[PDB]
Amino acid sequence: SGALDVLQMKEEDVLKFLAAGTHLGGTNLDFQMEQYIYKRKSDGIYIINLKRTWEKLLLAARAIVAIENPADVSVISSRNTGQRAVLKFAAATGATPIAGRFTPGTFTNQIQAAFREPRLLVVTDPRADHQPLTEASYVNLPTIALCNTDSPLRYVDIAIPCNNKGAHSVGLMWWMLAREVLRMRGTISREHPWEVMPDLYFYRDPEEIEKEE
Amino acid sequence: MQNDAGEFVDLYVPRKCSASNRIIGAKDHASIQMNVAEVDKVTGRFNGQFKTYAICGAIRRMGESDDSILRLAKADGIVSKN
Amino acid sequence: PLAKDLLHPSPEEEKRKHKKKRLVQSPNSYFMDVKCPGCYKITTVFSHAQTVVLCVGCSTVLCQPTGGKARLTEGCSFRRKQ
Amino acid sequence: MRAKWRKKRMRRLKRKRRKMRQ
Amino acid sequence: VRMNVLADALKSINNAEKRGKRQVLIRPCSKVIVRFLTVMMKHGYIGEFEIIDDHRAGKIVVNLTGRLNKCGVISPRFDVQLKDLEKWQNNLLPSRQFGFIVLTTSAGIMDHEEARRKHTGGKILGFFF
Amino acid sequence: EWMPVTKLGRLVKDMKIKSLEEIYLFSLPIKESEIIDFFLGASLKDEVLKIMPVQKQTRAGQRTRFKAFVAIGDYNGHVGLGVKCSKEVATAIRGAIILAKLSIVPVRRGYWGNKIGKPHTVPCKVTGRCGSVLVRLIPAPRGTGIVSAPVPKKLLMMAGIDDCYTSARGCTATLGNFAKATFDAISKTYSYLTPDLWKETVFTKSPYQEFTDHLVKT
Amino acid sequence: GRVRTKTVKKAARVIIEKYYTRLGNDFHTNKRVCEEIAIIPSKKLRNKIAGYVTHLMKRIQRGPVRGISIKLQEEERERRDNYVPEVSALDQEIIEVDPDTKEMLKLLDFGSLSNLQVTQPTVGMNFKTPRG
Amino acid sequence: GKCRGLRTARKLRSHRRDQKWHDKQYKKAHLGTALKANPFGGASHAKGIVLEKVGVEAKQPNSAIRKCVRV
Amino acid sequence: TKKRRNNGRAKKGRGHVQPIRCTNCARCVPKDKAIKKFVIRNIVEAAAVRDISEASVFDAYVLPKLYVKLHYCVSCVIHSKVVRNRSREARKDRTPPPR
RNA sequence: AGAUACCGUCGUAGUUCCGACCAUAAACGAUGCCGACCGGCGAUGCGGCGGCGUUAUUCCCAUGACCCGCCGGGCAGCUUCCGGGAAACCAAAGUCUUUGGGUUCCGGGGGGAGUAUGGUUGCAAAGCUGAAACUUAAAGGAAUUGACGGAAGGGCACCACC
RNA sequence: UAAAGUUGCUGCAGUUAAAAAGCUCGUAGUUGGAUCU
């Protein structure tokens, strides 16, 4: 942000975070995620300082915007909880998605079919996305990650402190990142709410779609 | 860099980590040079400017790239105080 | 990590430390004015007293030595100084 | 050969030598 | 037990610089440690430092600029004449273009170049580059 | 005809990168030897340091492959080392030449004493390590030449080092470890922070960012 | 003893990945289109390939296949995931918030929100699984 | 570790002097048993009288009769 | 070379551990090195349980169990398949088999 | 086959205690001691400190048993591109050609050989100190691939079986 | 003699390659915290 009141966090954003459980971390804390936690609860749960969450989300959006080829940003999700969110982010923002299993050698093996050379890498969970992250250490790839309290911060350059376990929180974080990136780009304004809503980025269990059909 | 006559005799000047000031090597493939888009103070949009931060692969391996980049952004006015 | 300010530790972190590993060592102990309802004068008791202190105006036990902090008898009002 | 049995042979040799040189 | 507090100080500085830390705590402090650190600072190798006064022996918080490759002590403090200074420079310094051998002479604690300028030998305390 | 496979290869072929030093400045991995042929492929000399027959025991015989250790480099400021193993010696040498091209690093040269002329020696004492083999390069006065074993001498000459003292420790009889240790020592020349490199780095536009439009539109 | 070799499987995958529009669900038509659009040097190989193609068509109708990937499936799935509920599952009238996160919000100057219901914390401190 | 003290010269020199005796070449060249057991007595050559011609069998990997003389 | 960091025993922080006799061969093995099994088995087999329960003068007498402590030496424990060889990586695993 | 062994039945010294000797073990962490610095995590033992809550001393505090943390020493464990190393592996076996914190002991290719000899100690057995002639191109460490195993676990076959 | 950093003060080794005394105590020896313009 930079104390720019146009970039300050809104009441609606705070309510979205509190409803998605974004502020709720885990029972374990990586020593490098200490600076992002407010305080531990009476039941061993760590609360995530959402001011730092917004600060890191804005920093990640700034890093994403400073790539004038949007397809040079790679958005990765191995878990099902963030595959639809990653696809929606790639569609809205113009990035390149990898939803599903990440084939090792994608960044390193020039001969492979899915070989690509992104300029920035964003992942849903450094624990579950450890394979692209490691390959990021081979091709000079900056990395953004949605990190929980116990997330490992190796090869993670911009760590966004948020709950990345629940589907609601993952979808909301990806939606907010897409919204911030678009707002910094110029498309869509900062005045009226975005016409898209977080539930598009969410993940529904197959039983949920069966219930909805 | 300089000889007695004053002309520069180096092949090139390697860049240094913005976090540790140590020289980033020619075959340090885990090092990154990340650009953070600058924003107009009133409109809150990309004005075409950015801040460049180079982090060597050692700091990224230690897991201190996050803290180092956050601190570099804070000192540049990108990140709000506290 | 890698940027900890060792000259200005936060007071909570410095109170968490061992009394000797602090930036400037300070004791965890204290002195208390203790007063008994059956007494007309106060006395000064060390928080970690190793002897059995008796009332200045009576014959009652005031604090019993323990492994660490002494056990002040109930009904006695104790207030820390400084 | 096991080293302890070599040691035992050497000790028996030394005893036989002690009997040699009284 | 602890001997050569300068050795411990320089080891702490070296280990903190290897780790990439911006600051290091040195304890206990001493006049020799402060003079060595000042000689280090005038050449731009460590930058500013602060002496915490506890009422038994000082501590020093040294800000670290990542310009330091190796700071080391030479134990025992061999007495060095001006003739042997070149041999010590060849042994301890990485190059003739940089690196300093610190000596305690009757004129104070100073690098080898200042010792040559003042035309004095002394006892070698250590080196830094 | 070279058809680039990577973004860096496309930028080099399209004359967007003007020297190897812009690639070195950003530590980008070079994965096509045609980039090295483009930038230095008029002064590069190759030299097979060794052909080593290695064997794998099998049920009905020893499978024998040959490992080619090849040093490369124009005798000014650039050197590379490549080790490639194959069932055929010629194929091994070809692969080793390609790998030595892929591993070419910039060599920093300095002055022993006073700084008249061009740099002639290593800027400082550097040490390379490979499997118990320690190779130390020490700056030497002008005109002394390379005071070393033949194996490190070949690499130091191909690196453009005019004169240098050396020390070796360990099992230098293993030519591969000796060569890799002296290559490490040579490559550490530019990674050494000397006081002339204390000036703050002025960051420039990376090749992938400064010609992103060209990559998109080509 | 009716496992399909990787030749048949790979050829069927390529045919399905390139020529989805032409083929159908009846083996006696898949074989004809395959022999039309491919050089299959044996009748038996063509029959095996067409049979696995029919099996793959029976596989795709019930859902996307792991080994099958064409642009048409991608657009159809993005159409399928173009689902947005009437009311957002996120924002509702009352959301529970613990006292500690309430203090965190009051630090952020968002502690005066009325959507927040201050729930009580856990009665005890039993959150570690027994060790052993 | 080794003693590094300004007054350890005697200890260091004594340790070096004792440990030199564990070097086979130094002990050979500084004991006198090797010199007294050397048939040449420390010389490079020696004159002798041939007592007989002998044929010494080569070591196991090779097969030959090396012609030598007892002098 | 060292096969195990603990040397195949649990003698950390002491110098001597009292020995025990192997239940199979009576070999002397340190108590922390021996492989210990605690078998709590029904005193009658699953075959004889039907006849024994049918012939019982009580109703729901519940047969008593048998609590046996076995201390195998390494040779006997390996021969009896109570433990078996493991790969160099899998040797480090210390969770008991699920059973 | 032979068994001067393994297996079995007996069974002396011994195994036990007291006093006097002996001073050796794969006496092992095969890793001297003292000191500083250098990652993380969860446990556990002792002491201390702080705190929701449960339980006992019929009820109040104290104190016990739990629970959640912190601090200090301790036996350890997991993890890590700290760094090291020939590697195995080691948060020490790291802070080592960028080589110096203090100090003791001790090694110098393999055998001959811990032998001969002298000295010393012991009642003895033996302990400590301890060579040389001669001989030899290798012994050896770690790891890899095979082959093999009277090692384990899987799989296959009417030239295997049911 | 150098090579031999295979006698290592510079400058070697001692978990497994040769090697830390079984273990403490202890005199000589070696080494010894801050501080005085």
Curated annotation (Swiss-Prot), chain A:
<dbReference type="GO" id="GO:0005829">
    <property type="term" value="C:cytosol"/>
</dbReference>
<feature type="region of interest" description="Interaction with PPP1R16B">
    <location>
        <begin position="53"/>
        <end position="112"/>
    </location>
</feature>
<keyword id="KW-0472">Membrane</keyword>
<dbReference type="GO" id="GO:0005737">
    <property type="term" value="C:cytoplasm"/>
</dbReference>
<feature type="site" description="Cleavage; by ST3; site 1">
    <location>
        <begin position="114"/>
        <end position="115"/>
    </location>
</feature>
<keyword id="KW-0007">Acetylation</keyword>
<keyword id="KW-1183">Host cell receptor for virus entry</keyword>
<dbReference type="GO" id="GO:0070062">
    <property type="term" value="C:extracellular exosome"/>
</dbReference>
<dbReference type="GO" id="GO:0000028">
    <property type="term" value="P:ribosomal small subunit assembly"/>
</dbReference>
<dbReference type="GO" id="GO:0003735">
    <property type="term" value="F:structural constituent of ribosome"/>
</dbReference>
<dbReference type="GO" id="GO:0006412">
    <property type="term" value="P:translation"/>
</dbReference>
<keyword id="KW-0225">Disease variant</keyword>
From Swiss-Prot, chain D:
<dbReference type="GO" id="GO:0003735">
    <property type="term" value="F:structural constituent of ribosome"/>
</dbReference>
<dbReference type="GO" id="GO:0006412">
    <property type="term" value="P:translation"/>
</dbReference>
<dbReference type="GO" id="GO:0022625">
    <property type="term" value="C:cytosolic large ribosomal subunit"/>
</dbReference>
<keyword id="KW-0963">Cytoplasm</keyword>
<feature type="region of interest" description="Disordered">
    <location>
        <begin position="1"/>
        <end position="22"/>
    </location>
</feature>
<comment type="subunit">
    <text>Component of the small ribosomal subunit.</text>
</comment>
<dbReference type="GO" id="GO:0005829">
    <property type="term" value="C:cytosol"/>
</dbReference>
<comment type="function">
    <text>Component of the small ribosomal subunit. The ribosome is a large ribonucleoprotein complex responsible for the synthesis of proteins in the cell. Interacts with the beta subunit of protein kinase CKII and stimulates phosphorylation of DNA topoisomerase II alpha by CKII.</text>
</comment>
<dbReference type="GO" id="GO:0003730">
    <property type="term" value="F:mRNA 3'-UTR binding"/>
</dbReference>
<dbReference type="GO" id="GO:0003723">
    <property type="term" value="F:RNA binding"/>
</dbReference>
<dbReference type="GO" id="GO:0005737">
    <property type="term" value="C:cytoplasm"/>
</dbReference>
<dbReference type="GO" id="GO:0005783">
    <property type="term" value="C:endoplasmic reticulum"/>
</dbReference>
From Swiss-Prot, chain E:
<dbReference type="GO" id="GO:0005730">
    <property type="term" value="C:nucleolus"/>
</dbReference>
<keyword id="KW-0539">Nucleus</keyword>
<keyword id="KW-0963">Cytoplasm</keyword>
<dbReference type="GO" id="GO:0005654">
    <property type="term" value="C:nucleoplasm"/>
</dbReference>
<dbReference type="GO" id="GO:0005829">
    <property type="term" value="C:cytosol"/>
</dbReference>
<dbReference type="GO" id="GO:0022626">
    <property type="term" value="C:cytosolic ribosome"/>
</dbReference>
<dbReference type="InterPro" id="IPR035987">
    <property type="entry name" value="Ribosomal_uS8_sf"/>
</dbReference>
<comment type="subunit">
    <text>Component of the 40S ribosomal subunit. Part of the small subunit (SSU) processome, composed of more than 70 proteins and the RNA chaperone small nucleolar RNA (snoRNA) U3.</text>
</comment>
<dbReference type="GO" id="GO:0003735">
    <property type="term" value="F:structural constituent of ribosome"/>
</dbReference>
<dbReference type="InterPro" id="IPR000630">
    <property type="entry name" value="Ribosomal_uS8"/>
</dbReference>
<dbReference type="GO" id="GO:0070062">
    <property type="term" value="C:extracellular exosome"/>
</dbReference>
<dbReference type="GO" id="GO:0016020">
    <property type="term" value="C:membrane"/>
</dbReference>
Curated annotation (Swiss-Prot), chain G:
<dbReference type="GO" id="GO:0002181">
    <property type="term" value="P:cytoplasmic translation"/>
</dbReference>
<dbReference type="Pfam" id="PF00833">
    <property type="entry name" value="Ribosomal_S17e"/>
</dbReference>
<dbReference type="InterPro" id="IPR036401">
    <property type="entry name" value="Ribosomal_eS17_sf"/>
</dbReference>
<dbReference type="InterPro" id="IPR018273">
    <property type="entry name" value="Ribosomal_eS17_CS"/>
</dbReference>
<feature type="modified residue" description="Phosphoserine">
    <location>
        <position position="112"/>
    </location>
</feature>
<dbReference type="GO" id="GO:0034101">
    <property type="term" value="P:erythrocyte homeostasis"/>
</dbReference>
<dbReference type="GO" id="GO:0006413">
    <property type="term" value="P:translational initiation"/>
</dbReference>
<feature type="modified residue" description="Phosphothreonine">
    <location>
        <position position="129"/>
    </location>
</feature>
<keyword id="KW-0687">Ribonucleoprotein</keyword>
<keyword id="KW-0597">Phosphoprotein</keyword>
<feature type="cross-link" description="Glycyl lysine isopeptide (Lys-Gly) (interchain with G-Cter in SUMO1); alternate">
    <location>
        <position position="102"/>
    </location>
</feature>
<dbReference type="GO" id="GO:0022627">
    <property type="term" value="C:cytosolic small ribosomal subunit"/>
</dbReference>
